[PDB]
Amino acid sequence: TFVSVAPGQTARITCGEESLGSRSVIWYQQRPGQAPSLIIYNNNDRPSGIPDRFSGSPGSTFGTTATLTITSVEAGDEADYYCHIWDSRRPTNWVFGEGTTLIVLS
Amino acid sequence: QVHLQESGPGLVKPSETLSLTCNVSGTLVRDNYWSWIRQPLGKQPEWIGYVHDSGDTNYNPSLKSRVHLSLDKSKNLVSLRLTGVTAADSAIYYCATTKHGRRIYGVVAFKEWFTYFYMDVWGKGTSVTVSS
Amino acid sequence: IHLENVTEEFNMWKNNMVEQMHTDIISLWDQSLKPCVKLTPLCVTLQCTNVTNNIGELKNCSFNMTTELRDKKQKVYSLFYRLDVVQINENKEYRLINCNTSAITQACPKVSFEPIPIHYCAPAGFAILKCKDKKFNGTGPCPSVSTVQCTHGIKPVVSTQLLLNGSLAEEEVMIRSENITNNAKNILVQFNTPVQINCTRPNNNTRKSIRIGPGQWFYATGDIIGDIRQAHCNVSKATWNETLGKVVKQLRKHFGNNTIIRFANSSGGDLEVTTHSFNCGGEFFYCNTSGLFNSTWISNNDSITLPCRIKQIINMWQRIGQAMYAPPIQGVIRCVSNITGLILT
Amino acid sequence: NIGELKNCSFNMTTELRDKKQKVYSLFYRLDVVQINENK
Ligand SMILES: *[C@@H]1O[C@H](CO)[C@@H](O[C@@H]2O[C@H](CO)[C@@H](O[C@@H]3O[C@H](CO[C@H]4O[C@H](CO)[C@@H](O)[C@H](O)[C@@H]4O)[C@@H](O)[C@H](O[C@H]4O[C@H](CO)[C@@H](O)[C@H](O)[C@@H]4O[C@H]4O[C@H](CO)[C@@H](O)[C@H](O)[C@@H]4O)[C@@H]3O)[C@H](O)[C@H]2NC(C)=O)[C@H](O)[C@H]1NC(C)=O
Ligand SMILES: *[C@@H]1O[C@H](CO)[C@@H](O[C@@H]2O[C@H](CO)[C@@H](O[C@@H]3O[C@H](CO[C@H]4O[C@H](CO)[C@@H](O)[C@H](O)[C@@H]4O)[C@@H](O)[C@H](O[C@H]4O[C@H](CO)[C@@H](O)[C@H](O)[C@@H]4O)[C@@H]3O)[C@H](O)[C@H]2NC(C)=O)[C@H](O)[C@H]1NC(C)=O
Ligand SMILES: *[C@@H]1O[C@H](CO)[C@@H](O[C@@H]2O[C@H](CO)[C@@H](O[C@@H]3O[C@H](CO)[C@@H](O)[C@H](O[C@H]4O[C@H](CO)[C@@H](O)[C@H](O)[C@@H]4O)[C@@H]3O)[C@H](O)[C@H]2NC(C)=O)[C@H](O)[C@H]1NC(C)=O
Ligand SMILES: *[C@@H]1O[C@H](CO)[C@@H](O[C@@H]2O[C@H](CO)[C@@H](O[C@@H]3O[C@H](CO)[C@@H](O)[C@H](O)[C@@H]3O)[C@H](O)[C@H]2NC(C)=O)[C@H](O)[C@H]1NC(C)=O
Ligand SMILES: CC(=O)N[C@@H]1[C@@H](O)[C@H](O[C@@H]2O[C@H](CO)[C@@H](O)[C@H](O)[C@H]2NC(C)=O)[C@@H](CO)O[C@H]1O
Ligand SMILES: *[C@@H]1O[C@H](CO)[C@@H](O[C@@H]2O[C@H](CO)[C@@H](O)[C@H](O)[C@H]2NC(C)=O)[C@H](O)[C@H]1NC(C)=O
Ligand SMILES: CC(=O)N[C@@H]1[C@@H](O)[C@H](O)[C@@H](CO)O[C@H]1O
Ligand SMILES: CC(=O)N[C@@H]1[C@@H](O)[C@H](O)[C@@H](CO)O[C@H]1O
Ligand SMILES: CC(=O)N[C@@H]1[C@@H](O)[C@H](O)[C@@H](CO)O[C@H]1O
Ligand SMILES: CC(=O)N[C@@H]1[C@@H](O)[C@H](O)[C@@H](CO)O[C@H]1O
Ligand SMILES: *[C@@H]1O[C@H](CO)[C@@H](O)[C@H](O)[C@H]1NC(C)=O
Ligand SMILES: *[C@@H]1O[C@H](CO)[C@@H](O)[C@H](O)[C@H]1NC(C)=O
Ligand SMILES: *[C@@H]1O[C@H](CO)[C@@H](O)[C@H](O)[C@H]1NC(C)=O
Ligand SMILES: *[C@@H]1O[C@H](CO)[C@@H](O)[C@H](O)[C@H]1NC(C)=O
């Protein structure tokens, strides 16, 4: 699972199964050889140091999977994007969902 | 800036107990919530568990009987002890600082909310295999 | 017609107009269910588990149901409130909680039970006398009398502990009883101000119909969209405390000016007698109400949240053998009522 | 000893359509007819 993005294009990254209840999605980007690094928590909260180009889908929906939009993708954003999901109607996930490799075509 | 330094032998025997240490610097290990995560090659990361204080710890249910976590405030180290190691436990092990938030979906008074976790500070990880 | 210089003796405890209202409401209630599909075909053994959520108010049950053809079967599953289901095999095996006692009839989904106000009118040869005495206590001589052919419109509201859609007292909270001093009798309290109560069923539900026979349909809960939350009611807190203060000032008239009055919660027993209940949005709510009666009044914005339970099989008139089944209501229910009075003992 | 009452048993329904019970009771011979001309 990967998305091929030319530099400057927007990545469309999905993760996990459909929501049943209120959801909190936490996204991390793992550059090769690195520990995963947090980009988004609580669906659309970006920690200081994270660019506004990273925007997550709301947790208010149901029947939807997590979606991450990365605009203006740069070569430095090449990474594996993984999500961890909390859902009020599902048991705690002790593992990450399968991610998407963001490949920058530079 | 907090520096998380994972360390161990990089190789443990099968049917053996593995012990890894995260040297925490720039913060007190007792004030933060700590967690361990591992990432087998080719896989997405798995949580191992988290540790802090006052009984507020938890474990991955598949490892709950095998993993024991501890924080030693006098050394400022995070300890990870995993017993019964086998080939399936080969992974990069990571030390991270975990933050806890809350999400409310209902009445609150009826406990219609949950806490959620995210990891802000990551170490570099220690690659540990299991081999004769 | 105001009747100049006319007085008369009234007794609300011997008022046969009440007796008719009771008798007639029941008769129409029953008449309305006569053309509806029976659910006695659902007295089957059900295999059942919990409805998926993170960590059980609702049951996820399944069974072998009939179809439009008598020689065919279908697998049917649906969501149930646990209060309508009993475990028998001490998945586990369950049966509907009323199969050992009653026939269950599904109410037709097209028929409203909204308490639309009606007026009662006297037949020729009769007249209704009425009081204009704002201080009348429901008994004895009434100093100011007038007459009508018809009463004001009265909403046939069905409730237990609280009265949610009646009239308010003209001036002061009125407390009436057959005796007050007799502990075997009820005390009815009529507020002179409304209290706002906001009740909800905060679950977006879906419904599906099952063809179980030739034009015979059963309405089953499908699933729940979004979060699963408990039903509840919100009572203005400030209003409630002010309201009780007024009630206490008036109660003391019969107990002593410096007598301490305490409000305690209900006694044990069935939900129909221990909780507050009402029918709104088509659902039958049972509310804990203890948060409303938890204080002591001694001489010299916020809200109270009350959890509520919901049931679908209702023994509406406290009779045995005639149970009504409330079909699921889709979407989300919001109800706002006027607390107009209380029944206390 | 050496016929007015008979002990008849049968497969009866119960409150649930999925359950059956074995029931027996006494009957007077005048209300019962033999079909297989226990019988
Ligand atoms: C009886 O009275 C009680 C008390 O008022 C009342 O309970 C309240 O019910 C409402 C029902 O919606 C609960 O509302 C939720 O509250 C959480 C927490 O509030 C935050 O935001 C407010 C905004 O002013 C702050 O003041 C507060 O401090 C908190 O910061 C909200 O987060 C909820 O909204 C989100 O989640 C919903 C879940 O489905 C989504 O549908 C909704 O769109 C929101 O999610 C989206 O936007 C978020 C914005 O940041 C974003 O973070 C999300 O990821 C997502 O994008 C919602 O407002 C309220 O907390 C209850 N309060 C208590 C104490 O119980 C009863 O309902 C009432 N009963 C009756 C019958 O009236
Ligand atoms: C105490 O007294 C109060 C006040 O009279 C009662 O509260 C009202 O109860 C009625 C009956 O349930 C409520 O009306 C319901 O509104 C639902 C939503 O309507 C929306 O859209 C209309 C469009 O014009 C708006 O006008 C309205 O404001 C809403 O925006 C309807 O869906 C209900 O039924 C209708 O739709 C269903 C759909 O399947 C049909 O099956 C029905 O036949 C019908 O067509 C219904 O109309 C009203 O909103 C309540 N008001 C308040 C303030 O709650 C209390 O219920 C009563 N207390 C008790 C316990 O009964
Ligand atoms: C799905 O369900 C599981 C199980 O119900 C749920 O996980 C549970 O979350 C609660 C917290 O919401 C955990 O409770 C903790 O228990 C420890 C033991 O002593 C406490 O110390 C913790 O205290 C924290 O919260 C307090 C709140 O006032 C704070 O005051 C305090 O400082 C701490 O912050 C806390 O009570 C419970 O152990 C877990 N259980 C499991 C098995 O995980 C999970 O979160 C649910 N997920 C979703 C999405 O609904
Ligand atoms: C318990 O509740 C669930 C719904 O909340 C009831 O329906 C079951 O829902 C699951 C998930 O939608 C269905 O699983 C399906 O499996 C197929 C297999 O290929 C898959 O393709 C679908 O995407 C989906 O995952 C399940 O079949 C469905 N069950 C039935 C009978 O339709 C469940 O039945 C309830 N249980 C009871 C005992 O009531
Ligand atoms: C207005 C009226 O008739 N009230 C009745 C009360 O008088 C009656 O009072 C009871 O009278 C008994 C006579 O021996 C007393 O022993 C008893 O304690 C007393 N109880 C009370 C509450 O006053 C009561 C109960 O029988 O019924 C009222 O209707
Ligand atoms: C029940 O719901 C109604 C409708 O939202 C509440 O009335 C509103 O209360 C707010 C409080 O500031 C006012 O600003 C609104 O104008 C009110 N709406 C209307 C139409 O008047 C009502 O207070 C709720 N009752 C309870 C007990 O919560
Ligand atoms: C629709 C349904 O549940 N049918 C079951 C059937 O699958 C099961 O095999 C049998 C006993 O084994 O009991 C029936 O009720
Ligand atoms: C289907 C059902 O609930 N049957 C009840 C039984 O559960 C209860 O135990 C008994 C008295 O306790 O009365 C029966 O009618
Ligand atoms: C309307 C009214 O006040 N009625 C009676 C009053 O006639 C009676 O005298 C008193 C007790 O003596 O109890 C009141 O309820
Ligand atoms: C209660 C009763 O009569 N049950 C019988 C059963 O004993 C018999 O074995 C079966 C056919 O063999 O037919 C059933 O009706
Ligand atoms: C209300 O909730 C409390 C919680 O302990 C319970 O004890 C009480 O009996 C409930 N009241 C009713 C009427 O069920
Ligand atoms: C309700 O009554 C109990 C009885 O002890 C009391 O402890 C509780 O605090 C009361 N509720 C409130 C909101 O005070
Ligand atoms: C329930 O969910 C459906 C999904 O399409 C939506 O259309 C409907 O309006 C929802 N109802 C409420 C009350 O939110
Ligand atoms: C309460 O009574 C007042 C009297 O005018 C009425 O206007 C109001 O709508 C009523 N509210 C409810 C919820 O019935």
Numbering used by the authors:
A (entry chain K): 5 to 6, 11 to 66, 66A, 66B, 66C, 67 to 95, 95A, 95B, ...
B (entry chain D): 1 to 82, 82A, 82B, 82C, 83 to 100, 100A, 100B, 100C, ...
C (entry chain H): 84 to 137, 151 to 185, 185A, 188 to 309, 312 to 323, 323A, 324 to 398, 411 to 455
D (entry chain G): 137, 151 to 185, 185A, 188 to 189
Text of the article:
The HIV-1 envelope glycoprotein (Env) is the sole target for neutralizing antibody (NAb) responses. The development and structural determination of soluble native-like Env trimer mimics, particularly ones based on the SOSIP technology, has provided a platform for structure-based immunogen design. Here, we describe a detailed characterization of neutralizing and non-neutralizing mAbs isolated from two rhesus macaques (RMs) previously immunized with the BG505 SOSIP.664 trimer. We therefore selected three Fabs (RM20J, RM20F, and RM20E1) that bound to different epitopes for high-resolution structural determination.
We solved a 2.3 Å crystal structure of the unliganded RM20E1 Fab and 4.4 Å cryoEM structure of RM20E1 Fab bound to BG505 SOSIP trimer and Fab PGT122. RM20E1 binds to an epitope composed of one gp120 and two gp41 protomers with 1178 Å2 of BSA. Residues 515 to 520 of the FP in the primary gp41 protomer are sandwiched between CDR-H3, CDR-L1, and CDR-L3 of RM20E1. CDR-H3 and FR-H1 make contact with HR2 in the adjacent gp41 protomer. Additionally, the FR-H1 makes contact near the N611-glycan site in the adjacent gp41 protomer, but we observed no connecting density that could be attributed to the N611-glycan itself. RM20E1 avoids the N88 glycan but does interact with residues in the C1 region of gp120, including H85, via its CDR-L1. Despite recognition of the conserved FP, RM20E1 did not neutralize the autologous BG505.T332N pseudovirus. The antibody did however potently neutralize the N611A glycan KO BG505 pseudovirus suggesting the epitope is shielded by the N611 glycan. The RM20E1-bound FP conformation is similar to the FP conformation when bound by the bNAb VRC34; however, the inability of RM20E1 to accommodate the N611 glycan likely results in the lack of neutralization of the wild-type virus. The epitopes of the FP-targeting bNAbs VRC34, ACS202, and DFPH-a.15 overlap to a large extent with the epitopes of RM20E1 and RM20F, with DFPH-a.15 and VRC34 also neutralizing more potently in the absence of the N611 glycan.
